[PDB]
Design a protein around this ligand. Structure first.
Ligand SMILES: Nc1nc2c(ncn2[C@@H]2O[C@H](COP(=O)(O)OP(=O)(O)CP(=O)(O)O)[C@@H](O)[C@H]2O)c(=O)[nH]1
Lengths: 82, 392, 205, 85, 61
RNA sequence: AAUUGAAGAGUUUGAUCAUGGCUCAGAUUGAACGCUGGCGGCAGGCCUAACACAUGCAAGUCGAACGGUAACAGGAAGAAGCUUGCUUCUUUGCUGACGAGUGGCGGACGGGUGAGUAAUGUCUGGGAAACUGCCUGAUGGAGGGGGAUAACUACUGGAAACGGUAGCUAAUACCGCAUAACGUCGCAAGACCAAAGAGGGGGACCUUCGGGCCUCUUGCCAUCGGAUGUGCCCAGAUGGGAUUAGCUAGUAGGUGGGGUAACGGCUCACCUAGGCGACGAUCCCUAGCUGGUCUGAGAGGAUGACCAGCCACACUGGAACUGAGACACGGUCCAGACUCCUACGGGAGGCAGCAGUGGGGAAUAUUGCACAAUGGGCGCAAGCCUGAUGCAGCCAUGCCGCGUGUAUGAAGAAGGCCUUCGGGUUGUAAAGUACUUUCAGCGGGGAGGAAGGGAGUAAAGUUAAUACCUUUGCUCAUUGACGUUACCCGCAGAAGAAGCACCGGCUAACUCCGUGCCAGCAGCCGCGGUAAUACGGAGGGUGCAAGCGUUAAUCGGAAUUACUGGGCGUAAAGCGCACGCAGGCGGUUUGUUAAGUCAGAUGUGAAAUCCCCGGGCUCAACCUGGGAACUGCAUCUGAUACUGGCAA
RNA sequence: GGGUCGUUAGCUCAGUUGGUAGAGCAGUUGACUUUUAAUCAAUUGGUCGCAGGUUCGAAUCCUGCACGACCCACCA
């Protein structure tokens, strides 16, 4: 089963989650098809901190990949219009 | 893992002493089964006591064996010490885990050299009151001859200042005791009664800085370096880093364990006999003979002064005085450090009976404290008994 | 991390007045300058090639108290840059926070400069800094925080600064000891003579 | 081993036993046809072929035969009987 | 067959010590060094210069 | 914006220039040792014994599959002490829930080690004879029947483990009957094949009063897709030795049968007698491979620990089953060795999963906390497990930062130290003195990592329904392992925090006293025989910095393996010379072709890593977005002067 | 921690039936000699591994110990 999840990168105490498309049967930071954008929950109030490649999201979810509830709530965060 | 122990009653330090081949270990077997009938359970068999097979090839307890028994009032960690003259150094070491014992001497023999030898050193290690239990009374039912035995032991104690008037001299047999006869089994029950009564519970401070003389390092295959010692003072938890003090040059070590006779325990307390695990230590780094203690509160030196008495040939000592160059071993609870005899200006030799004073020079630095007593043994038997006066 | 040894000894070693002991009394004059490196200053050096290269390298590091490995870190950082490395490294060395604070005039010596940064005093962009190795970002400001301001020293610290050359790439409010950073220091202004030419040759082997 | 999954062991046991019997009966209906072809009883062989037809598919449908092997048995065995039909 | 450093030593037939690689080119065959200040070959007595070598402790004072 | 980048010296000799060995100045490490040592951040932490192991833990879950309920708090009929509803308590699966068991799913994932494997592995790019749980889309179905069995009772073998025999019963367990199409066999006609029901809510209808029934969520069954994973083949590349030159007989292939998901000597049967090799076969030695790492001007050489992909193994060797997938770490069967228990008849176990211990070795850690966050398995959900993981601890192991203070200060003192005992030096150094107080230490404030989920309520869909359920707001209580948190404030006083190698030249920086080819030193040349710039120590000074040196390994200098870029009349090196096969090289003209070649476009060359430009941690290290490069390779279309094929 | 055997000049090492510490080379020191080497001679060496007990007499015998080595359990 393919899925959309976080990749948990970044240093110790500072997570830099890579929203990536990969099979659930893989490791957390393991083998992945493609990192579909990124996400930083602690990207201190500034310019960036969240980027979802909406193009491939609809495409991949429209293929069989399930978004993770975190990212699912992040889609509610990236708000298709807000 | 097994069985975390409960703090029901005080941990009293008791045991057995006596003349060689006098069924001391034999009595040891009976006392435990008594509380296996008067208390929950603490029974120990004669063979189960003897831990070594070489002890099963001579019958003598070459390696000091501890057994466990507890009365409906207090708990009693037992220390079965050998009576063999060639195993008194091991006896003095275990003496650093007692405050009062059971003088097990064969009733048919009476006060002899090895009975007399184990008693004197008792004062020099910290053993004030010992209730005397004379075994083998199923073969000598003669009251008249034995009335002198209980009489002269009270006199024998007076020879070494032990007030033999308050301490009871008890007669009994271990043969029928452990073997099912209601009579002599109840005679061991007499020892179960006197134990709680006479000797009270001295106040071992659990707040005083940590101290634990290394009794004997044990090879606990699975945990590593586990060592037992009497926490004469203070307490210790599974996590506090203490040092190894003694012969080798001191350094720290994390106490990652607290266990009592194969039973778990969170923290230690004063007067306690328990085993503690030490984090990342080789078996030979820490060694049988040193002392475990709290860091930053103790410093070791080598010398000290002392008022010394030498055993006369009338009591069982050596024959002549010792000259400069003589090096016996001074015993500070559990340490057998050899010490050169420094005689001051005037006394060039000390006769077997002089209570003279002189300066001491040992071979290894031990945590110095003015007052620590020591037994002096050389040539097969005791050559002295003294007390630390002043360290330089 | 700091040399923190006799600050005039390093002077006599090169004989050069490295302004280490600039302090209150303007000129040194109390050590028989130029001819007193150590116990045997009588021997005039044959000084080999490696020497002039090393005595140049040290000389620069002695002016700001820069450590060798740390200096080499500044070196490759100057190499990966474009243009003339000999000029890129000097701006990097000159761009030090304590260096700029000194250049603003907030202290007679660079000794107080580094010490001032460490003791929660210097504030840039409203953010207190303790790292002396702080490369000053372009076009900013620098100041001293109130609860550590003019503690009998700070005012007198700017005393000798009046008779300094007072650089161009920066200015200061001077009413609150609030300096102002401008463009990057250009080569022609800095150095004055210290041959950066020798330095680049040294580490190149 | 020490595991609740020891059930998966005895379950595979309970499985392989029943799985063996069906696979056993299946191959015998196959060998019966092959035995017929050895002679050339196109009447009975065809009959046995039709006879094993409902039992060959059922096994592949349950998860015993990989249904590619099943398709082969309905093809190569037909190639045998039609070659003498 | 390594050379025993230090002006004077205290090893004797057993002494389990450490061996650091080092030819001497003074004695043929000898291409090793005894580690002065190791397991048994302890610190050279009376050493003030180069005590990182010879395994000598910092002076008492 | 994306590689602006290259150094030598000492040494043969009386002395010189070459040739040619040796040695070092640098940097790096999965490093250790010695001496030393204040703290913090971010990484790393058994490379030797793929040697062996006590204890705890490392994968369990669903009652919304089923019979049940041995437990736990309630409900209900009853009871009893006695404050007659205060409570004591037997019944009872009626509930919330839930052991053991039946069944479903996973356990083949993640984790660990690198023994083996020299190519059935990997890396690169094409190809076709492949299968595909869970996820997703779409087309139909989802009818009706049957026989046992676990649990539980009972007798009972055995020390235990593990069972045995006779009765009882369910299911989404298993098996028929039916029904099937664009599915399978067949050219075709025809032939044959599947399954599973439960849960929530409810008006009329209706209760053999179990429910039939309306409806929604979901799951099951069959077909075509897709995605993903995986199997498979071909070419090329992917270590050493020729002092291994020959190797092989299912071996090379056809046809036919069998076998696999798939084609195939994968396996047999007959026949053919070939095939592999000097552009290096087979045999032997050794070894995880690649992205990358270290170094280097680049080119290469060495390496590949970690992060990551692939591969191989699981006490040793072999085999097979359940299953979509293993021919399986915490699975089975058997044999063997090594251990444990033994009632001696017989069984039980695999730390190369995280810690931990013994042994080994120069050499490396806690038997900590928690699923808070991320991911994963199961499940409607809530929840449960998770030694993956997120942290804390231990260690200077590395990379980076800071501090131990600053300013004044001549008396140019004390003392050490050298002396031409004049003086100088140590030395603004210290003291005295003016201020500051970082980090540690104590006492108080305090972010962010937290998205959700739960309940109540609102509206919008759905439906007979304002119900149940799904989506979206509001509200409440909240959810923290780290945590004596990041960070900030205050208090105290310069008080607690600097050593280490070296000083003849190489190669930074000097003398004295003492020892006398003695003790000694050392990377090379080399020093020491009564006046040592090298030995031992003292003074001074230098390099470096919480590190400094030593040992070791890698590369560079080494242009001493030279493709880039060397030599051979004599320094090592022209075979004694010639014929001559394969191979390599090839005059000149025209024309064509377009393999090499060149240009362009595209697919890929994973990501992380190296490079450039920005952003965030007080800065940095580090993390990090976008780009660049990934030098290669494949395909199509063009240029075609040159090499080459082909024609005269 | 146990019980069994060792330790002596600079070195290899002596000293039986308990009678009183030295042998061969030497480290080194003078001589021959090209320096020598060798060797001839000269100087010397232990508080008998530390001491004590029995000893008239103990390096010999009786143990306890520092420095070595084997089996015995070492299993909070
Ligand atoms: N008359 C009599 N003799 C007895 C009794 N118990 C033991 N004996 C004997 O006493 C002797 C000592 O036995 P042992 O058990 O070795 O004693 P121990 O106390 O270990 C002695 P050691 O001090 O040597 O270690 C043996 O001879 C034993 O058989 C008793 O009750 N009565």
């Amino acid at each position: 089963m393919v899925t959309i999840r976080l990749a948990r990168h970044g240093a110790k105490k500072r997570p830099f989650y890579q929203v990536v498309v990969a099979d659930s049967r893989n490791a957390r930071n393991g083998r992945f098809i493609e990192r579909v954008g990124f996400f930083n929950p602690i990207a201190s109030e500034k310019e960036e901190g969240t980027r979802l490649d909406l193009d491939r999201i609809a495409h991949w979810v429209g293929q069989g990949a399930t978004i993770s509830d975190r990212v699912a709530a992040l889609i509610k965060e990236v708000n298709k219009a807000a | 893992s097994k069985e975390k122990f409960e703090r029901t009653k005080p941990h009293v330090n008791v045991g057995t002493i006596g003349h060689v081949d006098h069924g001391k270990t034999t009595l040891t077997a009976a006392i435990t089964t008594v509380l296996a009938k008067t208390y929950g359970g603490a029974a120990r068999a004669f063979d189960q006591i003897d831990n070594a097979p070489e002890e099963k090839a001579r019958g003598i307890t070459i390696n000091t064996s501890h057994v466990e028994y507890d009365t409906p009032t207090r708990h009693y960690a037992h220390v079965d010490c050998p009576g063999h003259a060639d195993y008194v150094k091991n006896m003095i070491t275990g003496a650093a885990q007692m405050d009062g014992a059971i003088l097990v001497v064969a009733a048919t023999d009476g006060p002899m050299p090895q009975t007399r030898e184990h008693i004197l050193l008792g004062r020099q290690v910290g053993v004030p009151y010992i209730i005397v239990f004379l075994n083998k009374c199923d073969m000598v039912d003669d009251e008249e001859l034995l009335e002198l035995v209980e009489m002269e032991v009270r006199e024998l104690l007076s020879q070494y200042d032990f007030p033999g008037d308050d301490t009871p001299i008890v007669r009994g047999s271990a043969l029928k005791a452990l073997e099912g006869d209601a009579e002599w089994e109840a005679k061991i029950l007499e020892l179960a009664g006197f134990l709680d009564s006479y000797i009270p519970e001295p106040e071992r401070a659990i707040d005083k800085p940590f101290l634990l003389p290394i009794e004997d390092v044990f090879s606990i295959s699975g945990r590593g370096t586990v060592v037992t010692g009497r926490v004469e003072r203070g307490i210790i938890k599974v996590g506090e880093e203490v040092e190894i003090v003694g012969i080798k040059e001191t350094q720290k070590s994390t106490c990652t364990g607290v266990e009592m006779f194969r039973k778990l325990l969170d923290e230690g307390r004063a007067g306690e006999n328990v085993g503690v695990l030490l984090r990342g230590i080789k078996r030979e780094e820490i060694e049988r003979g040193q002392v475990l203690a709290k860091p930053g509160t103790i410093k070791p030196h080598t010398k000290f002064e002392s008022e010394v008495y030498i055993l006369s040939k009338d009591e069982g000592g050596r024959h002549t005085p010792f000259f400069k160059g003589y090096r016996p071993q001074f015993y500070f609870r559990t340490t057998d450090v050899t010490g050169t005899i420094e005689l001051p200006e005037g006394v060039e030799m000390v006769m077997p009976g002089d209570n003279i004073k002189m300066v001491v020079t040992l071979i290894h630095p031990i945590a110095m404290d003015d007052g620590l007593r020591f037994a002096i043994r050389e040539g097969g038997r005791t050559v002295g008994a003294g007390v630390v006066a002043k360290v330089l | 991390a700091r040399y923190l040894g006799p600050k005039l000894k390093l002077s006599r070693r090169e004989g050069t007045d490295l302004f280490l002991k600039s302090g209150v009394r303007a000129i040194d004059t109390k050590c028989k300058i130029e001819q007193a490196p150590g116990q045997h200053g009588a021997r005039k050096p044959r000084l080999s090639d490696y020497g002039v290269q090393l005595r140049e390298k040290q000389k620069v590091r002695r002016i700001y108290g820069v450590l060798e490995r740390q200096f080499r870190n500044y070196y490759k950082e100057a190499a990966r840059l474009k243009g003339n490395t000999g000029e890129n490294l000097l701006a990097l060395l000159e761009g030090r926070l304590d260096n700029v604070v000194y250049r603003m005039g907030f202290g007679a010596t660079r000794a107080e400069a580094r010490q001032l940064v460490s003791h929660k005093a210097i504030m840039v962009n409203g953010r207190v800094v303790n790292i002396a190795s702080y490369q000053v970002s372009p076009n900013d400001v620098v100041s001293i925080r109130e609860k550590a301001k003019k503690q009998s020293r700070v005012k007198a610290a700017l005393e000798l600064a009046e008779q300094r050359e007072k650089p161009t790439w920066l200015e200061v409010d001077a009413g609150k000891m609030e300096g102002t950073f401008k463009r990057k220091p250009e080569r022609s202004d800095l150095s004055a003579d210290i041959n950066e030419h020798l330095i680049v040759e040294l580490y190149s082997k | 081993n020490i595991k609740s999954a020891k059930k998966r062991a005895i379950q595979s046991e309970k499985a392989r036993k029943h799985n063996a019997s069906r696979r056993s009966m299946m191959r015998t209906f196959i060998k019966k046809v092959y035995a017929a072809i050895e002679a050339g009883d196109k009447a009975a062989a065809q009959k046995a072929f039709n006879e094993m037809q409902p039992i060959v598919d059922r096994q592949a449908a349950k998860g015993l035969i990989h249904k590619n092997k099943a398709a082969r048995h309905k093809a190569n065995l037909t190639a045998q009987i039609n070659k003498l039909a | 067959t390594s050379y025993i450093g230090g002006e004077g030593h205290n090893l004797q037939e057993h002494s389990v010590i450490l061996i650091r690689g080092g030819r001497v080119k003074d004695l043929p065959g000898v291409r090793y060094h005894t580690v002065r200040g190791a397991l048994d070959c302890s610190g050279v007595k009376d050493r003030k210069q180069a005590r990182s070598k010879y395994g000598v402790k910092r002076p008492k004072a």
